[PDB]
Enzyme design. Structure first.
Site, mmCIF file in Angstrom:
data_model
loop_
_atom_site.group_PDB
_atom_site.id
_atom_site.type_symbol
_atom_site.label_atom_id
_atom_site.label_comp_id
_atom_site.label_asym_id
_atom_site.label_seq_id
_atom_site.Cartn_x
_atom_site.Cartn_y
_atom_site.Cartn_z
ATOM 1 N N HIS A 42 33.376 -33.280 2.999
ATOM 2 C CA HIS A 42 34.594 -33.537 3.658
ATOM 3 C C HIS A 42 34.803 -34.978 3.401
ATOM 4 O O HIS A 42 36.125 -35.253 3.720
ATOM 5 C CB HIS A 42 34.365 -32.974 5.091
ATOM 6 C CG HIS A 42 33.714 -34.026 6.029
ATOM 7 N ND1 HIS A 42 32.579 -33.989 6.524
ATOM 8 C CD2 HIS A 42 34.365 -35.028 6.535
ATOM 9 C CE1 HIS A 42 32.020 -34.817 7.311
ATOM 10 N NE2 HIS A 42 33.149 -35.485 7.434
ATOM 11 N N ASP A 77 28.121 -28.722 2.709
ATOM 12 C CA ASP A 77 28.932 -29.999 2.790
ATOM 13 C C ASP A 77 28.512 -31.014 2.097
ATOM 14 O O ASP A 77 28.146 -31.900 2.442
ATOM 15 C CB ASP A 77 29.226 -30.319 4.411
ATOM 16 C CG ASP A 77 30.460 -31.260 4.671
ATOM 17 O OD1 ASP A 77 31.053 -31.589 3.547
ATOM 18 O OD2 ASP A 77 30.518 -31.582 5.648
ATOM 19 N N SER A 145 29.569 -39.924 7.820
ATOM 20 C CA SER A 145 29.361 -38.783 6.940
ATOM 21 C C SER A 145 28.995 -39.044 5.365
ATOM 22 O O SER A 145 29.646 -39.891 4.809
ATOM 23 C CB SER A 145 30.401 -37.885 6.705
ATOM 24 O OG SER A 145 30.458 -36.742 7.933
#
Length: 184
Positions: A42, A77, A145
């Site tokens: 992402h 992810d 992230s």
């Protein structure tokens, strides 16, 4: 309080920030999977386009680099990117191997909102009977992230999100992913 400031030059040598114009959209590390940047799907694919890699105030622009592999599954992810090796040395980024996670690893996690304005968290990381999944207690934030779960033994996994928001966080066990999921 749960965080300690980190002076540029004092973060691990593998840690790199992923920029989109002025915005830090997440983090990543240099590793081997060949040699690669590993970050969250992402961050690399579902945010605003990556335009630069930053480490300790040093910057390099992003060109059309090959995404070796990726998964947009909430639970995986990941994005594995082939960065030219000169770019890594322009930044002073040194590789770090993906080590096998355990039932309990003591971990530090690094993040910030700019390359030179970094802070650190500490927690523990734990494997699941869902082998791709890690859960951890390292305090993170928005923009953290793709940041590695560093132990003394090395990077045990990658931070990707939440298990329950503010109680328990979530990693992807990239060791299992690289060994059992990815095709050469």
């Amino acid at each position: 309080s749960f965080y300690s400031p980190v002076k540029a030059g004092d973060e691990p040598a593998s840690l790199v920030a992923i920029k989109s114009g002025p915005t830090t959209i997440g983090f990543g590390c240099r590793t081997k999977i060949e040699d690669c940047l590993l970050t969250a799907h992402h961050v690399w694919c579902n945010s605003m386009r990556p335009t630069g890699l930053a480490k300790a105030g040093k910057q390099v622009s992003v060109e059309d680099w090959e995404i070796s592999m990726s998964s947009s599954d909430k639970m995986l992810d990941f994005a594995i990117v082939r960065v030219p090796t000169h770019v890594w040395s322009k930044l002073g980024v040194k590789s770090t191997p993906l080590v096998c996670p355990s039932s309990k690893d003591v971990i530090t996690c690094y993040g910030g909102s700019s390359s030179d304005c970094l802070m650190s968290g500490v927690g523990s990381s734990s494997t699941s009977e869902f082998t791709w999944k890690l859960t951890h207690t390292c305090p993170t934030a928005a923009g953290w992230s793709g940041t590695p779960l560093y132990s003394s033994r090395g990077v045990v996994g990658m931070h990707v999100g939440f298990e329950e928001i503010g109680k328990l966080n979530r990693g992807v066990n990239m060791f299992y992913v690289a060994n059992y999921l990815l095709r050469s």
